[PDB]
Amino acid sequence: KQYIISEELISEGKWVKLEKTTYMDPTGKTRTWESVKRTTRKEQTADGVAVIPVLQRTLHYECIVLVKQFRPPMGGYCIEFPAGLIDDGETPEAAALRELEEETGYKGDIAECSPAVCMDPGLSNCTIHIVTVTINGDDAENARPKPKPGDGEFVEVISLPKNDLLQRLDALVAEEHLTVDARVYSYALALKHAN
Amino acid sequence: KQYIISEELISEGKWVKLEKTTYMDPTGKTRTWESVKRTTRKEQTADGVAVIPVLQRTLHYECIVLVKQFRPPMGGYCIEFPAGLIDDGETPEAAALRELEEETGYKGDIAECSPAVCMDPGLSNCTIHIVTVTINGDDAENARPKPKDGEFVEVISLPKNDLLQRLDALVAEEHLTVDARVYSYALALKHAN
Ligand SMILES: Cn1c(=O)c2c(nc(N3CCNCC3)n2Cc2nnc(-c3ccc(Cl)c(Cl)c3)o2)n(C)c1=O
Ligand SMILES: Cn1c(=O)c2c(nc(N3CCNCC3)n2Cc2nnc(-c3ccc(Cl)c(Cl)c3)o2)n(C)c1=O
């Protein structure tokens, strides 16, 4: 049984905080850790959601819908699962379908919803729900989606075949320099590893 | 189309720092962002590595070797891929094999090495390698390893063909959380069947 002993504020910004965390190990020694925390969430099951969108069309391979967007901390573009903070009072499933439509224009159905999972455990306390969402690419709504992005949001949609995800990801990075998100790569990696 | 303009320090810690980032959007408008950066080092292909350890035995289905460890920012224990910063001058492959060994006691072989991938693009510039490592669980060495040292890491081996449900089982406990990359991997294992 290891414990949080105390949490010291080091600096507060609007969106994110830097804290000094004092905890103690099974030996009984007090140690410290520099933790990052979002000031964004309070009461909820998690900060946000990540959406795994599976574009399903008859007589076709399933596509995985990914987004491409500039990330200021990375100082460059990244390939990611559609994601965003859960609003106040919203279910993970609802935030998932909302975010997906906002960024890609696709309207999907909930397939499954994960427990809250750590985004960056060794550095921060951000948790998310990973929501798998199927998209009927044959239904009339999804024939041609329309993104409804916010002010600061410029999002490009990228669909890659599920049956060949890992190599298509490597292909994109060959054509230009962008960085695949770790959750996306892990997903792609397991697809080839399975069986 | 979007570019970094300037990045000014807001507070610097011993390992990790907080910066404010100024950039320009495609329209030409100037915006800002609060970025987290490790002060630890820039020489590498990436900040660290995550190891996907595949326990291979002739009489069993492959296990995935995971670790359970207390994470102060989470204020609780987390189930993760063996991971750690890459030392300086060390290859991703070497750090992977080193880290896997330190945490689990297993000695493995490199299967494949990924490109640098972002840990948390909307918050930080941390990049890592996902290095796939096979473990000969039939070999005498690995009969049952002992994890080499300063911290406290519990080893958990779970069947690959049944990873996700075994993960959901463990995580229902009080402060035990599955890492997002671990869960994404497990999700894909199940979607693929
Ligand atoms: C911010 N910070 C540290 O980053 C730190 C730390 N204490 C330590 N260590 C841990 C290793 N032994 C010496 C002590 N470290 C290094 C470390 N531990 N875990 C990772 C890791 C895990 C996953 C990934 Cl993907 C990456 Cl890139 C890094 O980094 N303290 C006290 C701290 O505030
Ligand atoms: C630290 N920080 C922000 O977190 C921030 C931010 N500006 C904003 N917004 C963007 C949305 N519209 C209004 C402004 N946000 C909110 C936000 N943007 N992206 C996520 C997100 C992405 C992925 C995941 Cl997995 C999660 Cl859990 C969260 O959160 N600025 C300037 C900032 O420094």
Numbering used by the authors:
A (entry chain B): 14 to 208
B (entry chain A): 14 to 161, 164 to 208
The authors write:
Two predominant substrates have been identified for NUDT5: 8-oxo-dGDP and adenosine 5′diphosphoribose (ADPR). In addition, NUDT5 was recently shown to be responsible for the production of PAR-mediated nuclear ATP and, thus, subsequent ATP-dependent chromatin remodeling and gene regulation following progestin or estrogen stimulation in breast cancer cells.
Of the evaluated inhibitors, compounds 25 (TH5423, MG assay IC50 = 54 nM), 26 (TH5424, MG assay IC50 = 39 nM) and 28 (TH5427, MG assay IC50 = 29 nM) showed the most stabilization of NUDT5 in cell lysates. ITDRFCETSA illustrated that TH5427 was the most potent stabilizer under the described conditions with an apparent EC50 of 2.1 µM. TH5427 bound in a similar fashion to TH1713, with the same primary coordinating interactions. The theophylline moiety is anchored in place by stacking interactions between Trp28 (chain A) and Trp46 (chain B) and two hydrogen bonds are observed between the theophyline carbonyl oxygen atoms and the amide nitrogen of Glu47 (chain B) and the guanidinyl group of Arg51 (chain A). As expected, the piperazine moiety extended out from the active site while the dichlorobenzene tail extended deep into a hydrophobic pocket in a static position. Overall, the orientations of TH1713 and TH5427 were very similar and the additional functionality at the tail and 8-positions did not cause drastic changes in the binding modality. Of particular interest, TH5427 had no effect on NUDT9-mediated hydrolysis of ADPR, indicating discrimination amongst ADP-ribose hydrolases. Ensuing dose-response analysis for MTH1 gave an IC50 of 20 µM (cf. 29 nM for NUDT5), which results in an apparent 690-fold selectivity for NUDT5 over MTH1 in vitro. However, in combination with progestin stimulation, TH5427 blocked nuclear ATP synthesis, impaired hormone-induced chromatin remodeling, and disrupted progestin-dependent gene regulation and proliferation in T47D breast cancer cells.
